[PDB]
From a paper:
Lysine benzoylation (Kbz) is a recently discovered post-translational modification associated with active transcription. Here, we systematically characterize writer, eraser, and reader proteins of histone Kbz in S. cerevisiae using proteomic, biochemical, and structural approaches. In addition, we demonstrate that a subset of YEATS domains and bromodomains serve as Kbz readers, and structural analyses reveal how YEATS and bromodomains recognize Kbz marks.
We also tried to crystallize the ternary complex composed of Hst2, benzoylated substrate, and cofactor NAD+, but the solved complex structure at 1.8 Å only showed the density of 2’-O-benzoyl-ADP-ribose, the cofactor product. The appearance of 2’-O-benzoyl-ADP-ribose also suggests that the debenzoylation process utilizes a similar catalytic mechanism as deacetylation catalyzed by NAD+-dependent HDACs. The small domain consists of four α-helices (α3-5, α9) and three β-strands (β4-6). The superimposition of two structures by the large domains shows a 17° rotation of the small domain and the rearrangement of the α2–α3 loop involved in contacting the 2′-O-benzoyl-ADP-ribose.
Numbering used by the authors: 8 to 294
Write the structure that this text describes.
């Protein structure tokens, strides 16, 4: 583990004008205390999940939601952005941004913790959307998140928010199954893939080699799980994950670095080796 983290730091110091793409999953938010929508519990939500959902993921299915918004509403209450403090790993992303070495973070999480830790909106790509905004599912009119958040406080929750223009259901801009993923996801990955193949030279007579770091995901859900094998072979991949998964398990590459480590301790150790503790510590205390 510490040797692998050493190599990541050494690569970054050998390529100081190169940037890093992160691809992340639910594992980077577990230390924040965010419930897993699949896990049991005591709330109204777990009662509804057990009684009303034909399968766990239907809480995110747009056809189910139209027939019965209550399960999703009760889940949004427990995932409410603002409840949870971003993790050390989330702040590592902000630190890389401050150091100008964050190319992008592709996140499968809806919790908005990357943005809340201070990562810029244009550096975040959401594979399932997020709670950042609300929209009508029928016509697309933008709503202030506050209107949806007001309903979440009612006891009980009834009279779900409806569009004042067309009367259809309003919900956070999470991409539900049955909804199209925005064009910006695929076009951003197209552009960033092209950048991963680019020859970028600055200091000396050598290119600035980038890096892709995959963290806290089991790489079992498609289409997101297709991205790691789409990283060019000539670009070094890191997997920081409690288990080896996805393309790192089947078609491991000679240059792959696999680190079985918790995301928060990986961040501490990486910052350790990079010599960025002082900058990192200021960010953690401010937020
Ligand atoms: N501290 C730690 N440090 C390092 N690694 C850690 C760690 N703690 C755990 N791990 C490793 O973290 C991995 C977690 O894997 P897991 O499959 O749970 O999450 P995922 O992101 O890959 O899921 C992809 C999608 O699956 C769907 O259910 C869910 O869809 C939605 O939310 C969704 C929402 C709205 C609309 C539509 C969909 C999700 O977005 C495991 O390998 C653990 O070993
Ligand atoms: Zn509408």
């Amino acid at each position: 583990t510490e040797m692998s983290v050493r190599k990541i730091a050494a690569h970054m110091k050998s390529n100081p004008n190169a940037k890093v793409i992160f691809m992340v999953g639910a594992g980077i938010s577990t230390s924040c205390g965010i419930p897993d929508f699949r896990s049991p519990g005591t709330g109204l939500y777990h009662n509804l999940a057990r009684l009303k959902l034909p399968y766990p993921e239907a809480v995110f299915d747009v056809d189910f939601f139209q027939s019965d918004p209550l399960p999703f509403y009760t889940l949004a209450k427990e995932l409410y952005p603002g409840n949870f403090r971003p993790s050390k790993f989330h702040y590592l992303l902000k630190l890389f941004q401050d150091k100008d070495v964050l190319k992008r973070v592709y996140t499968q999480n809806i919790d908005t913790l990357e943005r809340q830790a201070g990562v810029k909106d244009d550096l975040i790509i959401e594979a399932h959307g997020s709670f950042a905004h609300c929209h009508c599912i029928g016509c697309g009119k933008v709503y202030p998140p506050q209107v949806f958040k007001s309903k979440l406080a009612e006891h009980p929750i009834k009279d779900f928010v409806k569009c004042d223009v067309c009367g259809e259901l309003v919900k956070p801009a999470i991409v539900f199954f049955g909804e199209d993923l925005p064009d910006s996801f695929s076009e951003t990955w197209l552009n960033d893939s092209e950048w991963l193949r680019e020859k970028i030279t600055t200091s000396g007579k050598h290119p600035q080699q980038p890096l892709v770091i995959v963290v806290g995901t089991s790489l079992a859900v498609y289409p997101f799980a297709s991205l790691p094998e789409e990283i060019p072979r000539k670009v070094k991949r890191v997997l920081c994950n409690l288990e080896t998964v996805g393309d790192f398990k089947a078609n491991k590459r000679p240059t792959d670095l696999i680190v079985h480590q918790y995301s928060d301790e990986f961040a501490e150790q990486l910052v350790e080796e990079l010599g960025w503790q002082e900058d990192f510590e200021k960010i953690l205390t401010a937020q």
